[PDB]
Ligand binder design. Structure first.
Ligand SMILES: *[C@@H]1O[C@H](CO)[C@@H](O[C@@H]2O[C@H](CO)[C@@H](O[C@@H]3O[C@H](CO)[C@@H](O)[C@H](O)[C@@H]3O)[C@H](O)[C@H]2NC(C)=O)[C@H](O)[C@H]1NC(C)=O
Ligand SMILES: *[C@@H]1O[C@H](CO)[C@@H](O)[C@H](O)[C@H]1NC(C)=O
Ligand SMILES: *[C@@H]1O[C@H](CO)[C@@H](O)[C@H](O)[C@H]1NC(C)=O
Ligand SMILES: *[C@@H]1O[C@H](CO)[C@@H](O)[C@H](O)[C@H]1NC(C)=O
Ligand SMILES: *[C@@H]1O[C@H](CO)[C@@H](O)[C@H](O)[C@H]1NC(C)=O
Ligand SMILES: *[C@@H]1O[C@H](CO)[C@@H](O)[C@H](O)[C@H]1NC(C)=O
Ligand SMILES: CC(=O)OCC[N+](C)(C)C
Ligand SMILES: [Ca+2]
Ligand SMILES: [Ca+2]
Lengths: 189, 202, 135, 68, 93
């Protein structure tokens, strides 16, 4: 009756025969559609001399797992749960143009899992990426630093990326006092 | 002590305690987490990078109804230390940090009372970004804030509340370069979100 | 899919596959590993410290006869992705590195073909020591 | 030796020895720890940063009735 | 029959009752002779102001384990193997 017992029963049922090393699609021809977005927490540093940009972002990911499904009516109307993201399959989205940092997400927060198989995973990440610096009009210069994200080992026929939103989310942005973000748009390639 | 080993094995028995489940029953009730930052030392304030480094204890308290026992059956034992990695924790982190270090530094043991009250006091070294006001330098007073949230659970699952309205200086070592004036704490909701809650210290 | 996860459990089953043992077959033979370095960016050359920093993709290819399967028995699957941390890897490292970082940075998956061919292409940020000629 | 391996397996056996529990026979009993600091080398003193770096061997002695 | 299978059998045999916390001597009075050497890869720095030398070296060590012996004739003539060093007893140099 209690919610904790129902949640324990659900967790036991879900991970009974779950394989985290297998792409979670019922049919091999199916594509794992991963909705990808960014949210910039702050622009820590733009290093003109070293031509690196350091950003604090939240990597917002959302996909569907066909094995992590349940009917809430059988589990005391439990509609979603938080599970460690290291227990389940995740896409291997990495930053291509990394420089002096980590290629992949390393924090591995909990993933929000919904009764219909939807998984929302929004880990944070400090990225140090390379960008060419144009100092023709310094100190009146405007820089254009890019971040390239994509899966490392799954081609378009297996994992496909979708722009959650055109513009990088800046609701929780920490204004720096040295730079202003004129535009921050993600382009699918 | 054999009694303490027996109690620790009984409490954390996997057949009856799962740390992946939030201790909230009878519907998705709220787990109220009391927060109290105690400032051990103000390590530094690097003005050029606008980063303040502090050494604090992130005192946290909540109630876990699954970690109760009868003291009479365990030699009148009214408290026990349990490894924090083996019990459900409210993943309260520093959101406004720079350098991307969110969690506590050590993950010390949690002190469990026989009534299910958890008292966790982990040390943390935090590098928090703050806005430097250079107008009156070198006679300047800075207002650097530390924002604390749970990066796992929202206001509908855990409620963050302030144990006291000011950060504690009970174990503070004066910095020698910066002087503490005030360390108030405030609990912030969002009138139009209903899933946002944070505790900020100025 | 069910068949894909069945294959993955069959291949990496510790009772039949040990990742500490070299995939040597036909006796006291040797495993041939093919290397190819792809320079993705020359991040920097630090003359004062004599360190070159590069972003490279290190292609490593070898054959592991233990990771073979019949495509007919597994819904005509011709290749699968396996975590590189759970298979035998040739411990290929950058010897002349400065900063004491030998291994690749990410440890991506390894693409395994049904005949045992292993294709691994991890990215790496490498800092190697080189002699700067200042004349 | 076989005897040493047998003894080490017996002592550290997690079934009978929990390393997270203080070796106190009674609840009110307390474990006495003896400390001694040996200064191997005073590496540096940084006046600006206000830090002393030392190389010390920290002797620590106590009793564990479970390791008998 | 394959070298890999014989090596798997050997690995199962060697670590059946192996303890990595016990000094590897057949007799308590025996001494573990550790042949020790250094091979310098590069002298990274000689910090005169701080009075420190940074070196990159290979710490060559060599000892005998009396519980890690086998007959190669019983394992398809497997004469040696590479094992993780954290699975075995090592001197604490
Ligand atoms: C240090 O910095 C913080 C953050 O910038 C300052 O906090 C802000 O203080 C103002 C003035 O007290 C607050 O506005 C007032 O809020 C109350 C409460 O709702 C309202 O009744 C008033 O009408 C007014 O709107 C503001 O909410 C507050 N913001 C935050 C995020 O805390 C703080 O004042 C600074 N302190 C010093 C000494 O510089
Ligand atoms: C998988 O999808 C393909 C393409 O539509 C289809 O031909 C095949 O029958 C599907 N497999 C199953 C098991 O439904
Ligand atoms: C189940 O919970 C949802 C909220 O998550 C609520 O809207 C719905 O009414 C509940 N249904 C029942 C049958 O309790
Ligand atoms: C910034 O760079 C991107 C890709 O290099 C390009 O598509 C875009 O037009 C650039 N914007 C400006 C304002 O230069
Ligand atoms: C171990 O060596 C000592 C000294 O030579 C000897 O007295 C003793 O018998 C040896 N033990 C065994 C079991 O051989
Ligand atoms: C065993 O292998 C060694 C090389 O490691 C070789 O010299 C020797 O002749 C081999 N013996 C047999 C019986 O195969
Ligand atoms: C298969 C594989 O690992 O490819 C890595 C390189 N990339 C991302 C260009 C395809
Ligand atoms: Ca800068
Ligand atoms: Ca020097």
């Amino acid at each position: 009756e209690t919610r904790a017992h129902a949640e324990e029963r659900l967790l036991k049922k879900l991970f009974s025969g779950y394989n985290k090393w297998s792409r979670p699609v019922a049919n091999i021809s199916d594509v794992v559609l991963v909705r990808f977005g960014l949210s910039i927490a702050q622009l820590i540093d733009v290093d003109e001399k070293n031509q690196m940009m350091t950003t604090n972002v939240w990597v917002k990911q959302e996909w569907h797992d066909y094995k992590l499904r349940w009917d809430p009516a059988d589990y005391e109307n439990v509609t979603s749960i938080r599970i460690p993201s290291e227990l389940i399959w995740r896409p291997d989205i990495v930053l291509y143009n990394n420089a002096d940092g980590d290629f992949a997400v390393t924090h591995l927060t909990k993933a929000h899992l919904f009764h219909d198989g939807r998984v929302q995973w929004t880990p944070p990440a400090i990225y140090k990426s390379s960008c060419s610096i144009d100092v023709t009009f310094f100190p009146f210069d405007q820089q254009n630093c890019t971040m390239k994200f994509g899966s490392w080992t799954y081609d378009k026929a297996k994992i496909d990326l979708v722009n959650m939103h055109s513009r990088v989310d800046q609701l929780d942005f920490w204004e720096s006092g040295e730079w202003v973000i004129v535009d921050a748009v993600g382009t699918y390639n | 002590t054999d009694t303490e080993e027996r109690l620790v094995e009984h409490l954390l028995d996997p057949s009856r305690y799962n740390k992946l489940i939030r201790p909230a029953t009878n519907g998705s009730e709220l787990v109220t987490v009391q927060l109290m930052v105690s400032l051990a030392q103000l390590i530094s304030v690097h003005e050029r990078e606008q980063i303040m480094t502090t050494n604090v204890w992130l005192t946290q308290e909540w109630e876990d109804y699954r970690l109760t026992w009868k003291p009479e059956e365990f030699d009148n034992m009214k408290k026990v230390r349990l490894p924090s990695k083996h019990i459900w924790l409210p993943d309260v982190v520093l959101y406004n940090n720079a350098d991307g270090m969110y969690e506590v530094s050590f993950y010390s043991n949690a002190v469990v009372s026989y009534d299910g009250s958890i008292f966790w006091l982990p040390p943390a070294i935090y590098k928090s970004a703050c806005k430097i006001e250079v107008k009156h330098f070198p006679f300047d007073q800075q207002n650097c804030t530390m924002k604390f949230r749970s990066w796992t659970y929202d206001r509908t699952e855990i409620d963050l509340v302030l144990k006291s309205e000011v950060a504690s200086l009970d174990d503070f070592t004066p910095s020698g370069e910066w002087d503490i004036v005030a360390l108030p704490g405030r609990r912030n909701e969002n009138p139009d979100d209903s899933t946002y809650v944070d505790i900020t210290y100025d």
